[PDB]
């Protein structure tokens, strides 16, 4: 029984359990703000320091994890809300793409839209070049921001959103259940083999980016985590 | 969107929001002791008053729901810790089986271990008659307690456990993630069609049965559920 | 040397192991409920019947003890949560203060809040009448409820809390580490010469007190304890 | 609050959560074995991989921590048991003393007997040079295997121990509570200022060494940590 869990009701520049990437910045309160509002093509990402082992080439067993977080996006004239937020998983050596252009890559892929990540994106700005659907949305991305599957979601300025991902390794089904402002929930799922698209040890994080014409406020609020691996 | 949401920190026998059925009683703090210990073949069930439409035959759309709740199963000599609690989903006119028999029917099935329902059971006694595993577990039950899928679980006496369930209409997946005391977490997932296996309107609830020689305590401590069915 | 250890996962009116006092009552899930909620100025206590010897005058040595216990306190309209639970150590003949008054005495002190005992008080009502910190606090008490040491704590309604308490004799330091629900721990410590405060043999127990305006649910869940006295 | 909890009921090589040093090896049943037998002057350390910041230069606050763990020492024909185990706290960039003699240093101090580290030790071999007591003892070490204070203890071949440590920041009182196979608890405490003896960030871990004449089995059955740091 190999478990790894943690809790964050407020973050802070300092706590080694958390490492920053890009323009993340800690707020007077406790929240985290990924993108910078004055930089062009900004990119921010944040992830748990110590990496997590999600499977053993020894037992072949895959790990199951339960997570949940609360973010919040918010408009800001005269720019356009973009591009959004992505909850990802990446090799223990993941850096913000080389000279990343930011924009709709969500700071996790390259210009073409690819990279070595598996995540959940809360895309608010529909990017043609990546086959985004003409509306805001929740989607599953694998080694590319050209989501494998998506789902009609609605970004609400100032709305405090709440997410809950459940990974059942016995089926390898990634399950996402978003909890909007008003109550309506949005659910998305996609059977993705982690042991096949990711290395033994990986890192869990949050990325958010903006273009030149679009910049929005990206704040992460809470992120509890627990992942158990079985070894026998 | 046609949503339905509620949250219970503690209940009562009066709050018409809850339907009590049988041995079900209510502690002096809000916990719902399902089974009675002095009675043999006891059966406790607590449905959620107001029924919920989980699919419109007109639109074919199946509702998606995210629920999380907490229970507790504490031993009591000289009996056995059987059979356990079950979070089921059954038609709006559902009632404890005609001339029930506690035991491993859990208050949802007949003698043959059959019935009209869908649920996540937390089994602690191996009743070979309905082909159960050899140890405590968590199974997904479809019109039967002879589970469709099982994962080895570990019930702990006087252990506050946490269950989070996500049903994603799109994939018709019933993701289950248990969070035992210590920290380790147990998960099991499956594909259920509800619509296929159920009427448009039903009720969500818990249940607990108790054989002749084996009785135990089944406390339901908290419960939140939010269902939504896109339709328009 | 001479050790005295025990363990309680449940209790039950019909066990010579514990003396009941006040308005105490045992629930169906094996839980000592201190205060009864339909009475003004309620005081129920509970303690190990067999008086334990913490120190002997012949040798001059004091014993060290290790104890852990868990309790649940829960809110309810229309009264306000108070006053709270207190783990205390008193003389072998310790009785509930003559003609109690409830309020911030926790069943150990009188009207002036002073008595013969030494205990840990998980406080929920700021009884300024006894120089109480303006928030749910934690503190060590020595012959009164006008704490020597206090620590901002935070009691969560309907939340299961654990507590480990250490008392080293060589330093006579009372260590206390409260583990809330969410995980963070609140701790407090102090120097206390039991030998100079309490008599050779003393009983250990729990006590909760209510008032006319305010009341709440006091649940003592489990209790294991161990103490060793050097005899040379 | 900035808590950091984890816990292992068993260990496994590779798990990025743990860092192994020296002669450390993991047994086939989840136990770690700090020392090597057929080797001379064996030293074995195991650290919680990720660093925990034990104090903030911003507020000046220390953190409190509640950790408990289980260790076992067994005799091997006809090498005398030596020297013992040590739960320590030291600067993250902590490595095994270059050219460590092992033995009475337990591999956390040099020949002289000093080193930058705080820690509780379960010493079991009279090392005149380090002013150790005449018998198996326990002690709170502060930058020297020459314990600031020790108490009599007793290593029992193949016996499993039970230790609970609590460091209350409000008093800077590190208190330990041992539990011999038989039952007697063993308390010892001391005021160590983890704010003034170490650097904001440290690593926790267990170290075990030996000699040529002295050798033995050191196993660590399970370790569970938790440390909250208030930041406001
Ligand atoms: Ca985009
Ligand atoms: Ca059964
Ligand atoms: Ca008070
Ligand atoms: Ca030594
Ligand atoms: Mn997209
Ligand atoms: Mn079953
Ligand atoms: Mn007080
Ligand atoms: Mn020593």
Curated annotation (Swiss-Prot), chains A, B, C, D:
Binding annotation for Mn(2+): 121, 123, 132, 137
Effect on the protein of changing residue 162 to I: In minor form
Binding site for Ca(2+): 123, 125, 127, 132
Molecular-function GO terms, alphabetical: carbohydrate binding; metal ion binding
Keyword hit for Calcium: yes
Mutagenesis / variant outcome for changing residue 92 to V: In minor form
Entry keyword set: Calcium, Lectin, Manganese, Metal-binding, Signal
Function: D-galactose specific lectin.
Recorded family membership: Belongs to the leguminous lectin family.
Note from the entry: Binds one manganese (or another transition metal) ion and one calcium ion. The metal ions are essential for the saccharide-binding and cell-agglutinating activities.
Record note on quaternary structure: Homotetramer.
Name of the protein this chain belongs to: Galactose-binding lectin
Species, as recorded: Arachis hypogaea
Source lineage: Eukaryota, Viridiplantae, Streptophyta, Embryophyta, Tracheophyta
Included range, full protein: 24 to 255 of 273
């Amino acid at each position: 029984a190999e478990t790894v869990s943690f809790n964050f009701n407020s973050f802070s520049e300092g706590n080694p359990a958390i490492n920053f990437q890009g323009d993340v910045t800690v707020l007077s309160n406790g929240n985290i703000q990924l993108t910078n509002l004055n930089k062009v093509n900004s990119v921010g990402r944040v992830l748990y320091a110590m990496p997590v082992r999600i499977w053993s080439s020894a037992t072949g067993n895959v790990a199951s994890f339960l997570t949940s977080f609360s973010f919040e996006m918010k408009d800001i004239k005269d720019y356009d809300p973009a591009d959004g937020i992505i909850f990802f998983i990446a090799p223990e050596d993941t850096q913000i793409p080389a000279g990343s252009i930011g924009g709709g890559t969500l700071g996790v892929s390259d210009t073409k839209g690819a990279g070595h990540f598996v995540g959940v994106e809360f895309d608010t700005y529909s990017n043609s070049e990546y086959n985004d659907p003409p509306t805001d949305h929740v989607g599953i991305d694998v080694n590319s921001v050209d989501s494998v599957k998506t789902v009609p979601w609605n970004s609400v300025s100032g709305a405090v959103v709440k997410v809950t991902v459940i990974y059942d390794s016995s089926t390898k089904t990634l399950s996402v259940a978003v909890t909007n402002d008003n109550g309506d929930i949005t659910t998305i799922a996609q059977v993705v083999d982690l042991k096949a698209k990711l290395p033994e040890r990986v890192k869990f994080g949050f990325s958010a980016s903006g273009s030149l014409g679009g910049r929005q406020i990206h704040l992460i609020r809470s992120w509890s985590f627990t992942s158990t691996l079985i070894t026998t």
